[PDB]
Design a protein around this ligand. Structure first.
Ligand SMILES: *[C@@H]1O[C@H](CO)[C@@H](O[C@@H]2O[C@H](CO)[C@@H](O)[C@H](O)[C@H]2NC(C)=O)[C@H](O)[C@H]1NC(C)=O
Ligand SMILES: *[C@@H]1O[C@H](CO)[C@@H](O[C@@H]2O[C@H](CO)[C@@H](O)[C@H](O)[C@H]2NC(C)=O)[C@H](O)[C@H]1NC(C)=O
Ligand SMILES: *[C@@H]1O[C@H](CO)[C@@H](O[C@@H]2O[C@H](CO)[C@@H](O)[C@H](O)[C@H]2NC(C)=O)[C@H](O)[C@H]1NC(C)=O
Ligand SMILES: *[C@@H]1O[C@H](CO)[C@@H](O[C@@H]2O[C@H](CO)[C@@H](O)[C@H](O)[C@H]2NC(C)=O)[C@H](O)[C@H]1NC(C)=O
Ligand SMILES: *[C@@H]1O[C@H](CO)[C@@H](O[C@@H]2O[C@H](CO)[C@@H](O)[C@H](O)[C@H]2NC(C)=O)[C@H](O)[C@H]1NC(C)=O
Ligand SMILES: *[C@@H]1O[C@H](CO)[C@@H](O)[C@H](O)[C@H]1NC(C)=O
Ligand SMILES: *[C@@H]1O[C@H](CO)[C@@H](O)[C@H](O)[C@H]1NC(C)=O
Ligand SMILES: *[C@@H]1O[C@H](CO)[C@@H](O)[C@H](O)[C@H]1NC(C)=O
Ligand SMILES: *[C@@H]1O[C@H](CO)[C@@H](O)[C@H](O)[C@H]1NC(C)=O
Ligand SMILES: *[C@@H]1O[C@H](CO)[C@@H](O)[C@H](O)[C@H]1NC(C)=O
Ligand SMILES: *[C@@H]1O[C@H](CO)[C@@H](O)[C@H](O)[C@H]1NC(C)=O
Ligand SMILES: *[C@@H]1O[C@H](CO)[C@@H](O)[C@H](O)[C@H]1NC(C)=O
Ligand SMILES: *[C@@H]1O[C@H](CO)[C@@H](O)[C@H](O)[C@H]1NC(C)=O
Lengths: 88, 50, 198, 222, 149
């Protein structure tokens, strides 16, 4: 690979979501009897929007989704005694 | 000078009085063999993380 | 692993401290990494040199640790400012900023504490089931063109309705759903229909 | 000289006089942002003590300096990968524009991928790429997402924006004629929609001219 | 001598690593800003002033670049402005009429009501204006006739 020489990884053609990043678009993961494989990670299933100048898609139903966003706020207020650490 | 690396046939044209090459970042790049009038490029031996 | 973002932080700090502690086990060029041994084994003339080496090493380790802590504290301050902004504009209100308060259209948010961090439950509205329709930007009725106040014109194949654009709610086209402007020789894509007048 | 802040311009304020615009312009600006660095990694043992056993033995006295330095640089590289991932990988799927370009007169051929191109990059993308320009323990790790993948991500986002508006971000992509999307946007800026439909050709031409001006500016000024 | 060299090289490496850490914090801030811009500017339509280009924001288009992103901000900017006489309300029959969405204007003789961001005069009707109070309160009220459809 462009990242180097990979040994012990079974090179497959099918693309999957990246699990253990290697580099240059290549990611490795343990998959099924089971073995380690390296593959060109996929960006998601492709799709085509049936766009035309007189066609609009309107929703008829809906879903209320609760997502979770995690943010760190503060660290541990560490304090070091300089003279005791250096010159105990 | 002393070092470690791989000596390869070069592509440069050293002057008759030049001995040691030098890259932009003050690193030895090529040398003139004292006996044979041939210029040798010094490519450091392959290495990398595992 | 869901709370990895928090865990990482903790781990990093711990790791830092650990290395600092392990830096007490290094000689840094001295003859022993234990100050008591150097004091018990040498007289001041050279004990001073040995302790100087040890002090230089430990001071360098302390400075490195302090700089790491300062940079990580800058990181955490940035994250805390982001969290405060989210709490202000997401909990105490309703943000129309896209994807800044959860995927989809934002409805509200609920904050939750967590060790050295916060967790936002973002309640958002997401359209699920969709239908194709033929659409027109406006319709002639009496030469004049009608544009929809709120919503778009749609056709189920035969008839024309005006429905809000985020939920299929077909309504008959009338003069209280649509407003007039000019005439319908300029708009591109106009279609004929009747605008019932109440 | 003593620098002048700007051109003096007194406003003719009055308690019964208002100034209302009668016309507009559709202006396209360009905003450039850095997203990542070069994923550099340094091998302290080879840098400090290149091929020297005694030097390595002496260096081993200094404890775990190398471990924490390598750890910091690895964290930096991981952080750069995360930065690129979060900046670009914001679309769940990879949408692609249909062959028909009936975008209400708007012309995106300067930003959509070129099927006959070096790496499926758009004209402005190629301009940007062309306007930007060892073995001593220093290495440059490759980015996780190759430029082709970043181009695919920008293409997916752009196609979603063109063919679905903003709905593709909130949920499933909902197609819509581009003229009606711009009508939504005008309603979004407090200008009634009829302004658009009565001035559709002018707005499309102005947008095309703005994109051309951006092209020329990028091609001329490095 | 090798102790001296090791100390020196370690100090140089530490300085380089600290500089890299600070510059990477800068670049992380820039990348967070770019992600926020892409979310609120491309995937939607921002109403934050001067956050997505000078003027009223319409849309944005992302473009890749080597280790960076480039936003094409499409924005709407009013250009040609006219002076009109104005009033905060107009007095018809003792009642004060204010515009539902717009502002009253006058070209010298007649009073119209136009949307604020684009001059589109419309005759004043009880569907353009809403009633409130009387004409003895508002400071600056003018006289006119509100046509009833
Ligand atoms: C489109 O919608 C219209 C309005 O609902 C449909 O017309 C009605 O159809 C029902 C039968 O389902 C009749 O009972 C009504 O009398 C009809 N009303 C009118 C005004 O025509 C129409 O059938 C729908 N078309 C399609 C293809 O679904
Ligand atoms: C909507 O209906 C009107 C009729 O009221 C159509 O106007 C006609 O247009 C044709 C050209 O295609 C002319 O030859 C006729 O003289 C027009 N009639 C009138 C009364 O003006 C109009 O074309 C229709 N719109 C569409 C899109 O078909
Ligand atoms: C609004 O401004 C645009 C551009 O400034 C005008 O379009 C121009 O119209 C003149 C006619 O006097 C033409 O000569 C130009 O070629 C047009 N420019 C473009 C780019 O199309 C438009 O007429 C103005 N509208 C109003 C109502 O003032
Ligand atoms: C969109 O604009 C581009 C140019 O901005 C058009 O491409 C030009 O097409 C003409 C006619 O064939 C050529 O002479 C030019 O050399 C082309 N320029 C470039 C840069 O390719 C393109 O045709 C326009 N799109 C549509 C649908 O008209
Ligand atoms: C102010 O605007 C009104 C509305 O357009 C003008 O009144 C019209 O003037 C035109 C002349 O261009 C006549 O053909 C119309 O019959 C008038 N309509 C009405 C209802 O009076 C008025 O002249 C304008 N005044 C000034 C000073 O510009
Ligand atoms: C993958 O596909 C290539 C052709 O595109 C083929 O040469 C190769 O053998 C395939 N490998 C596997 C593991 O299927
Ligand atoms: C909307 O989806 C729910 C599933 O949660 C379903 O029960 C309901 O019938 C759907 N509504 C319509 C109108 O299809
Ligand atoms: C050095 O001696 C060798 C043989 O011993 C000869 O081939 C070579 O040409 C000599 N070089 C010079 C520069 O005289
Ligand atoms: C709309 O029509 C297209 C045909 O191109 C189809 O693929 C799509 O599934 C239709 N929409 C829905 C919601 O089924
Ligand atoms: C829309 O596209 C169709 C071709 O599929 C064309 O026949 C029609 O005239 C177009 N309508 C408008 C308003 O551009
Ligand atoms: C409006 O009037 C002021 C002075 O009363 C003048 O300076 C200004 O230029 C006028 N506006 C326009 C657009 O001409
Ligand atoms: C506006 O200013 C003029 C100038 O003196 C004054 O005559 C008039 O009463 C003022 N109107 C209001 C509403 O303040
Ligand atoms: C408006 O008309 C009333 C009579 O209906 C009159 O008393 C008042 O002075 C007038 N105001 C102006 C500003 O002309």
């Amino acid at each position: 690979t462009r990242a180097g020489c990979l040994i012990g990884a079974e090179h497959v053609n099918n693309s999957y979501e990246c699990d253990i990043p290697i580099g240059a678009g290549i990611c490795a993961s343990y998959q099924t009897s089971q073995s380690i494989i390296a593959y060109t990670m996929s960006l998601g299933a492709e799709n085509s929007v049936a766009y035309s100048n007189n066609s609009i898609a309107i929703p008829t139903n809906f879903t209320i989704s609760v997502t979770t966003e995690i943010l760190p706020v503060s660290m541990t207020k560490t304090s070091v005694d300089c003279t005791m650490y250096i010159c105990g | 000078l002393t070092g470690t690396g791989v000596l390869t046939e070069s592509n440069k044209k050293f002057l008759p009085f030049q001995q040691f090459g030098r890259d932009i970042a003050d690193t030895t790049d090529a040398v003139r063999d004292p006996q044979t009038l041939e210029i040798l490029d010094i490519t450091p031996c392959s290495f990398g993380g595992v | 692993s869901a709370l990895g973002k928090l865990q990482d932080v903790v781990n990093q700090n711990a790791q830092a401290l650990n290395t600092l502690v392990k830096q007490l086990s290094s000689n840094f060029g001295a003859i022993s990494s234990v100050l008591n041994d150097i004091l018990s084994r040498l007289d001041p003339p050279e004990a001073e040199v040995q302790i100087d080496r040890l002090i230089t090493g430990r001071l360098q380790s302390l400075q490195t640790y302090v700089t790491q802590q300062l940079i990580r504290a800058a990181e955490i301050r940035a994250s805390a400012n982001l969290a405060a902004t989210k709490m202000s504009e997401c909990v105490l209100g309703q943000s129309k900023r896209v994807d800044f308060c959860g995927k989809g259209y934002h409805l509200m948010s609920f904050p939750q504490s967590a060790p050295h961090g916060v967790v936002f439950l973002h309640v958002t509205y997401v359209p699920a089931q969709e239908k194709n329709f033929t659409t027109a930007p406006a319709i002639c009725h009496d030469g004049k063109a009608h544009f929809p106040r709120e919503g778009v014109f749609v056709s189920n194949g035969t008839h024309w309705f005006v429905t809000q654009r985020n939920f299929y709610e077909p309504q008959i086209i009338t003069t209280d759903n649509t407003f007039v402007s000019g005439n319908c020789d300029v708009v591109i894509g106009i279609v004929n229909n009747t605008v019932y007048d109440p | 000289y003593t620098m002048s802040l700007g051109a003096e311009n007194s406003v003719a304020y009055s308690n019964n006089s208002i100034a209302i615009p009668t016309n507009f312009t559709i202006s396209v600006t360009t905003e450039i942002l850095p997203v990542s660095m070069t994923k550099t990694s340094v091998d302290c043992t080879m840098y400090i003590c290149g091929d020297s056993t005694e030097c390595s033995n002496l260096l081993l006295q200094y404890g775990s300096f190398c471990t924490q330095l390598n750890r910091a640089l690895t964290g930096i590289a991981v952080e750069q990968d995360k930065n690129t991932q979060e900046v670009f990988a914001q679309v769940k799927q990879i949408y692609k524009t249909p062959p028909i370009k009936d975008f209400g007169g708007f012309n995106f051929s300067q930003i959509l991928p070129d099927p006959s191109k070096p790496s499926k990059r758009s004209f402005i993308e190629d301009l940007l790429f062309n306007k930007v320009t060892k073995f001593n323990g220093l290495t440059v790790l490759p980015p996780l997402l190759t430029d082709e993948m970043i181009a695919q991500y920008t293409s997916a986002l752009l196609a979603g924006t063109i063919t679905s508006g903003w709905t593709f971000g909130a949920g499933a992509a909902l197609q819509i004629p581009f003229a009606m999307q711009m009508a939504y946007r005008f309603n979004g800026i407090g200008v009634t929609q009829n302004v658009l439909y009565e001035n559709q050709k002018l707005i499309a031409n102005q947008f095309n001219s703005a994109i051309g001006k951006i092209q020329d500016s990028l091609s001329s000024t490095a």
